[PDB]
From a paper:
Cathepsin H is a lysosomal cysteine protease of the papain superfamily involved in protein degradation. For preventing premature activation, cysteine proteases are synthesized as inactive proenzymes called zymogens that contain a prodomain and a mature (catalytic) domain, and the removal of the prodomain leads to the activation of the enzymes. Upon activation, cathepsin H displays a distinct proteolytic activity among the papain superfamily, functioning predominantly as an aminopeptidase that cleaves a single N-terminal residue from a polypeptide chain. Unique among papain-like cysteine proteases, the mini-chain (the octapeptide EPQNCSAT from the prodomain) remains bound to cathepsin H through a disulfide bond and is essential for the aminopeptidase activity.
We also mutated residue Cys26 in the active site to Ser to avoid potential autoprocessing and determined the crystal structure of procathepsin H C26S mutant at 1.66 Å resolution. The wild type and mutant structures are essentially identical with an RMSD of 0.14 Å for all Cα atoms. Ligand/ion in the structure of C26S mutant: N-acetyl-D-glucosamine, β-D-mannopyranose, α-D-mannopyranose, sulfate ion, chloride ion, trehalose. The helical subdomain is positioned on top of the right domain of the mature domain while the C-terminal extended portion traverses the substrate binding cleft toward the N-terminus of the mature domain, preventing access of the substrates to the active site. The mini-chain (Glu76P-Thr83P) in procathepsin H connects the N-terminal helical subdomain and the C-terminal linker in the prodomain, and is located right above the active site cleft of the mature domain. It is largely solvent-exposed and, except for the disulfide bond between Cys80P and Cys212, makes limited water mediated hydrogen bond interactions with the residues lining the cleft. However, these three catalytic residues in procathepsin H are shielded by a group of hydrophobic residues Tyr72P, Leu73P, Trp74P from the prodomain, which effectively blocks the access to the catalytic Cys and prevents external substrates from entering the binding site. Structural comparison with cathepsin H revealed that the mini-chain in procathepsin H runs in the direction opposite to that of the substrates while the mini-chain in cathepsin H follows the substrate binding direction, suggesting that the negatively charged C-terminal carboxyl group in the mini-chain of cathepsin H is positioned to interact with the N-terminal amino group of the substrate whereas the cleaved mini-chain in procathepsin H needs to reorient to be involved in such interaction. In addition to the proteolytic processing of the prodomain, the activation of procathepsin H requires the reorientation and repositioning of the mini-chain along the active site in the substrate-binding direction from the direction opposite to a bound substrate.
Numbering used by the authors: 24 to 335
Write the structure that this text describes.
């Protein structure tokens, strides 16, 4: 039990108003305790020496158990694979890449809501980018179609799934509709796929060999953004800026629980990093993005990377 000071109390009242919360007296006391515990963790972290900072955001009054249940995948996915098809060529590669800078090649940051559907945003993001790079047209593709319709490829809607499996679904389904015709609901619904309204199509799926992080570097440098999955832990939820790293996340395929999109890479103060688009809205992290340490299979990010070749 924490003794909450007036500074924390006043800021929680502001946070509740900003995030449109209503709590009973009883739940309020519990939510305040969680908020104050996270407040102290953020300050303890930022007051020390680390490569990234933490901050308040929409997750600040949630326990990590609640966050896992609502926002992350509910069970291990079939990330481990003994077969792959991507074969890396030869470096060196450019010292830095950022597909947001090369042109209009990365779609805006979206919000998955309280649904474990990050695999769908990783998938649409990678395919949106691949189509924009190939044809110069930026589309917004329907994550909801993947949530509702991709179960024959071992995906599980709001309980989880994998980008490579979702790319295969789009290939054999003969395409994916736009957000405009198939809006995102943040919950599992009936499949409403209409063949004549598909606007995005997959020709091939590239699966990067397990732990082949240097192939991810080549793919981002030469071809396009790359979907990947990693293990989110408690302190990642509170990431604000800088280069994320952790000594407590696992690095194995059976522990990854969130999928995202690598859109570039770089280095700061001798620390290599990935530039990564998330799906928790544009005010999480660095305008919806984060940096994560590169070259260490950090949090298992090289366990099951993949990207699509579009049919255009
Ligand atoms: C990269 O990683 C992904 C994800 O793990 C792997 O995805 C698998 O990809 C294979 C193709 O390589 C997929 O298998 C194909 O599925 C198609 C759809 O199957 C459904 O529909 C048919 C009827 O049309 C049903 O019979 C079936 O039960 C399903 O309901 C099939 O149409 C394909 O069949 C064709 O190929 C097979 C042999 O491959 C022949 O037997 C057939 O006659 C036909 O020619 C095929 O089965 C599979 O669904 C994907 N799995 C998942 C979980 O997504 C990639 O393989 C992987 N790539 C590499 C290189 O590692
Ligand atoms: O979200 C928790 C539930 O997930 C599954 O149910 C959802 O997904 C089904 C398709 O996989 C939909 O048919 C169902 O309508 C959704 O609620 C799971 O089947 C449930 O047991 C979980 O409670
Ligand atoms: O053997 C399983 C481990 O493979 C990877 O680590 C090896 O390969 C890396 C480059 O892909 C090297 O940097 C690392 O030094 C090697 O140990 C993977 O990163 C590890 O998590 C796996 O355990
Ligand atoms: C993994 O693949 C196996 C074999 O196809 C399947 O039975 C199982 O449901 C899959 N697991 C998940 C979490 O998709
Ligand atoms: Cl520098
Ligand atoms: Cl910033």
């Amino acid at each position: 039990e924490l003794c909450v000071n007036s500074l924390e109390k006043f800021h929680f009242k502001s946070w509740m108003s900003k995030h449109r919360k209503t709590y009973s007296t009883e739940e309020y006391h519990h939510r305040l305790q969680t908020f104050a515990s996270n407040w102290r963790k953020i300050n303890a972290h930022n007051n020390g020496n680390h490569t990234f900072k933490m901050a308040l955001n929409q997750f600040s009054d949630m326990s990590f158990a609640e966050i896992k249940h609502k926002y992350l995948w509910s069970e291990p996915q079939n990330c481990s694979a003994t077969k792959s098809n991507y074969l890396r060529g030869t470096g060196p590669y450019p010292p830095s890449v950022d597909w947001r800078k090369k042109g209009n090649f990365v779609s805006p940051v979206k919000n998955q809501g309280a649904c474990g559907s990050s695999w769908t945003f990783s998938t649409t993001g990678a395919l949106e980018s691949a189509i924009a790079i190939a044809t110069g047209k930026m589309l917004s593709l329907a994550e909801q179609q993947l949530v509702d319709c991709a179960q024959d490829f071992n995906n599980h809607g709001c309980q989880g799934g994998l980008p490579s499996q979702a790319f295969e679904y789009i290939l054999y389904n003969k395409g994916i509709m736009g957000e405009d015709t198939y809006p995102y609901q943040g919950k599992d619904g009936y499949c409403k796929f209409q063949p004549g309204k598909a606007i995005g199509f997959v020709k091939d799926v590239a699966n990067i060999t397990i732990y082949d992080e240097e192939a991810m570097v080549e793919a981002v440098a030469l071809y396009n953004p790359v979907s990947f999955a990693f293990e989110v832990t408690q302190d990642f939820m509170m990431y604000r800026t800088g280069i994320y790293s952790s000594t407590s996340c696992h690095k194995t395929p059976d522990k990854v629980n969130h999928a995202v999109l690598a859109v570039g890479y770089g280095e700061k103060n001798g620390i290599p990093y990935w530039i990564v688009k998330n799906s928790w809205g544009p005010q999480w992290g660095m305008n919806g993005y984060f940096l994560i340490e590169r070259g260490k299979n950090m949090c298992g990010l090289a366990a099951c990377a993949s990207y699509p070749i579009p049919l255009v």
